[PDB]
């Protein structure tokens, strides 16, 4: 989401409004684990 | 009916001319929950503080003018012992906690006679500074005794005399003309109240819940409720009748929650 309150409509397609990775094919987790 | 006895702890106050208890805002102003702004387990009601504390107010005389008044800050009066209002364990607990949330049950006593006339408006007023002098300092017990009753004036009707911060020599001192803490004497009946009319009763009862700009408040500085006793109709009687009838009051803190225990408060 981010700082976005637009729930309604998206005029431009996702791949144009944003960049997406190409394929190679609440609950905050810890950044450290003691083992 | 008109004869009631209200018990609380090792305390009981009786009246034979009750008008009923005026409950403010809700049917049971006693229902209340812990403050959401404190994560520490609060100290709640215990029998030594679940009771009525009684104190005195200055006597009512023929000379007191219409709209003249007396104010009792809550819990302020407990802290200064106004009218001899010593809060026993309540004050001791209050002095040892940063925060305190509670409601109040109050009864004002003033018996007259079937031959006297006059009426007092008794109200519980939210958020006032009627116990403070315009210079910002709280009225001392001596000052309250010297004035007896505060006369209604342009200053009070206007809020022109409420406490304020002096601007400093850098600024031209402005003409203070109004303040949000004013008192419109004609509208004091908007608050939870009862009228003590010489001809109808010798007491009045009011029961209010906790209120505040925040879930709980500073023990030492809050003043969300103020007991106000104001003359509506001047006292009068014929020679021979008892003069200067006295006025007393009883206060009971309800559903208190204390947070932030620490050593006794010490002025800085």
């Amino acid at each position: 989401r981010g700082n976005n309150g637009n729930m309604t409509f998206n005029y431009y397609a996702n791949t144009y409004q944003n960049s997406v990775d190409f394929s190679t094919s609440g609950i905050l987790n810890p950044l450290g684990y003691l083992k | 009916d008109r004869v009631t006895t209200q018990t609380a702890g090792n305390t009981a106050i009786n009246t034979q001319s009750s008008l009923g208890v005026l409950c403010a805002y809700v049917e049971d102003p006693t229902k209340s929950d812990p403050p959401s702004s404190s994560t520490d387990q609060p100290t709640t009601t215990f029998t030594a503080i679940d009771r009525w504390y009684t104190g005195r107010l200055n006597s009512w005389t023929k000379a007191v003018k219409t709209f003249s008044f007396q104010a009792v800050p809550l819990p302020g009066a407990f802290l200064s012992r106004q009218g001899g209002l010593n809060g026993g364990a309540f004050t001791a607990t209050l002095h040892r906690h940063f925060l305190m949330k509670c409601g109040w049950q109050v009864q004002v006593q003033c018996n007259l006679t079937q031959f006297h006339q006059g009426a007092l408006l008794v109200a519980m007023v939210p958020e006032t500074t009627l116990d403070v002098k315009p210079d910002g300092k709280a009225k001392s017990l001596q000052e309250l005794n010297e004035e007896q009753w505060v006369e209604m004036s342009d200053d009070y009707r206007t809020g022109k005399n409420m406490p304020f911060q002096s601007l400093g020599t850098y600024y031209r001192p402005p003409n203070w003309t109004w303040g949000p803490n004013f008192i419109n004497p004609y509208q004091v009946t908007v608050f939870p109240h009862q009228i003590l009319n010489a001809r109808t009763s010798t007491s009045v009862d009011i029961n209010v819940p906790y209120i505040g700009e925040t879930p709980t408040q500073s023990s030492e500085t809050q003043n969300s409720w103020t007991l106000l006793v104001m003359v509506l109709v001047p006292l009068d009687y014929k020679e021979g009748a008892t003069t200067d009838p006295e006025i007393t009051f009883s206060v009971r803190p309800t559903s208190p929650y204390f947070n932030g225990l620490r050593n006794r408060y010490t002025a800085g």
Partner: protein, 238 residues
């Protein structure tokens, strides 16, 4: 592609009362809950219904304290066939100035419904007496006589165990709404007069104070309504 539009003549206009929202600049803000707070007010009529004190110039005999206005009327002992007190049913009249009904009503252009006058006897309990409260719709001349008041809407109040008497001023108007402020005097902004007559003089036993006082309150009746918010009068700050 682009949607063709035709912006209207009033484009870019800023309307202070536009019935719509504007863009949020700092959203996603959660606020402290207010469930703990009792006494919520939904409509100002809830306050206009609470009776508050009226104000009368103390009979040509003021106290050394300037601005001698009182919330009551002392009942004189001498007989006189005219009202003890009377005032117009014009919401902008000074007698309502500091009552909540009047203060709140002055901030709207119209009202509809009943106004309520409440009287409370504050003399000694040993006192007895009767009063005649009356309301007269507009007439060329204001009624003064008991005989005239008695022909209008009225009720006789008896002093006794119960201290008060409520008097509802009926809403009798040619129009469904009336003006709240009598800018110009007309049948739409001035609706007659309310007056109080002493029917039978007050009787007291020996050694009793004379001139008992009657407290006056005003409030909105249950069918009272206010319409059209208007600009406030900021003079209270001068």
């Amino acid at each position: 592609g682009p949607i063709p539009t035709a912006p209207r003549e009033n484009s870019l206009m800023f309307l202070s009362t536009l019935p719509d929202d504007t863009v949020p600049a700092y959203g996603n803000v959660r606020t402290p809950p207010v469930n703990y707070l009792p006494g919520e007010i939904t409509d100002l009529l809830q306050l206009a219904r609470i009776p508050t004190l009226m104000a009368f110039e103390r009979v040509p005999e003021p106290v050394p304290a300037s601005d001698t206005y009182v919330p009551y009327v002392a009942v004189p002992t001498q007989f006189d066939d005219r009202p003890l007190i009377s005032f117009p049913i014009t919401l902008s009249d000074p007698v309502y100035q500091n009552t909540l009904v009047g203060a709140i009503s002055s901030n709207f252009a119209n009202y509809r419904g009943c106004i309520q006058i409440t009287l409370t006897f504050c003399g000694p309990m040993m006192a007895r007496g009767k009063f005649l409260l009356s309301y007269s719709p507009p007439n060329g001349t204001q009624p003064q006589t008991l005989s005239e008041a008695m022909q209008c809407t009225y009720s006789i109040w008896d002093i006794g165990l119960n201290s008060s008497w409520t008097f509802v001023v009926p809403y009798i108007s040619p129009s469904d709404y009336r003006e709240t402020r009598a800018i110009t005097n007309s049948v739409y902004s001035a609706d007659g007069w309310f007056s109080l007559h002493k029917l039978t003089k007050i009787t007291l036993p020996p050694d009793c104070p004379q001139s008992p006082c009657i407290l006056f309150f005003a409030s909105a009746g249950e069918d009272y309504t206010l319409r059209l918010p208007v600009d406030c009068n900021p003079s209270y700050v001068f």
